[PDB]
Design a protein around this ligand. Structure first.
Ligand SMILES: [Fe+3]
Length: 307
């Protein structure tokens, strides 16, 4: 069978494996981990890696592995299952799901009318002590990688230095949401699905929160694309290509619509969970996935004192 380095969620991917194996008989072994962990591990393994497939929550760790020259071209028929805007132009990997940046806020701490117009506005001195984020996570680092691609090094580093003055750090994006929910800060920068996931359980970590979408092609409207790819070293290329085709195809994208992950489908003509605000109404900035640079992001955040 095939070996998948999986930095996407264990439960979502297991439902993909369930349908994929049922229809093809191809068995899948998951090696689960985080974006940056598994990305760096693949670069170190190089062509000696036992992985056939790499899946990520966000794009920068895909770019890391592609920069190392480790991905095989994806089948053209697979690439055509996803629109070009949710896909690197070079076709060596593909988007498999999406997540929207949001400002999660506590209405008892901050009225909707007081929310920042731009993610860049959180650098202003009036925001000191009033917002949070998880800078060690690949989630927030991907958001900063979009700001870097959109705004450039100097403007991004200036924003990061003001964030060091202004923000409150927490370990984990769900932790940020819990802190907002408890009223420790006015709000925080996370991805949209965390609130949906918790509301589908007890809601005890989210009931005092609401989601704000920056829109207007703001850096804060960045839509982060989860990635999938076939390793060039794979000895099971047909099976590996078929797994990517499955997860980006109608049945695989269907799971995104009906499961409890609340992440967006990216497939052509694919409906997303109806509780989500449609991606086409969010007016995300144009951000080429290959332009997202996780190494420079870590350096800038370290220069700012955040890591
Ligand atoms: Fe995440």
């Amino acid at each position: 069978g095939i070996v998948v380095y999986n930095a996407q969620h264990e439960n979502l991917v297991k439902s993909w494996v369930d349908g994929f194996t049922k229809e093809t008989g191809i068995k899948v072994t998951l090696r689960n981990g985080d974006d940056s962990e598994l990305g760096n591990q693949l670069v170190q393994e190089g062509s000696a890696s036992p992985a056939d497939v790499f899946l990520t929550e966000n794009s920068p760790s895909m770019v890391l592995v592609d920069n190392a020259k480790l991905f095989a071209p994806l089948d053209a028929a697979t690439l055509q299952q996803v629109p070009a805007q949710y896909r690197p132009q070079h076709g060596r990997w593909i988007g498999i799901a999406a997540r929207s940046t949001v400002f999660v806020y506590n209405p008892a701490k901050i009225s909707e009318a007081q929310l920042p117009h731009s993610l860049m506005d959180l650098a202003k001195p009036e925001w000191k002590g009033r917002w949070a984020a998880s800078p060690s996570g690949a989630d927030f680092q991907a958001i900063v990688s979009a700001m870097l691609a959109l705004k450039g090094e100097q403007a991004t580093l200036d924003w990061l230095k003001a964030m060091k003055t202004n923000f409150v750090a927490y370990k984990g994006n769900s932790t940020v949401m819990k802190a907002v929910n408890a009223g420790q800060i006015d709000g925080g920068v996370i991805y949209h699905y965390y609130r949906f996931v918790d509301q589908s359980k007890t809601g005890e970590n989210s009931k005092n929160t609401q989601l704000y979408y920056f829109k207007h092609q703001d850096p804060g409207a960045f839509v982060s694309i989860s990635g999938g790819g076939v390793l060039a070293s794979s000895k099971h290329k047909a099976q590996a290509q078929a797994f990517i085709k499955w997860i980006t195809g109608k049945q695989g994208q269907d799971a995104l619509r009906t499961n409890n992950a609340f992440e967006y489908a990216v497939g052509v003509d694919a409906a997303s969970n109806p509780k989500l605000t449609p991606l086409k109404d969010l007016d995300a900035p144009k951000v080429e996935p290959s332009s997202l640079n996780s190494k420079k992001v870590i350096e800038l955040m370290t220069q700012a004192g955040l890591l």
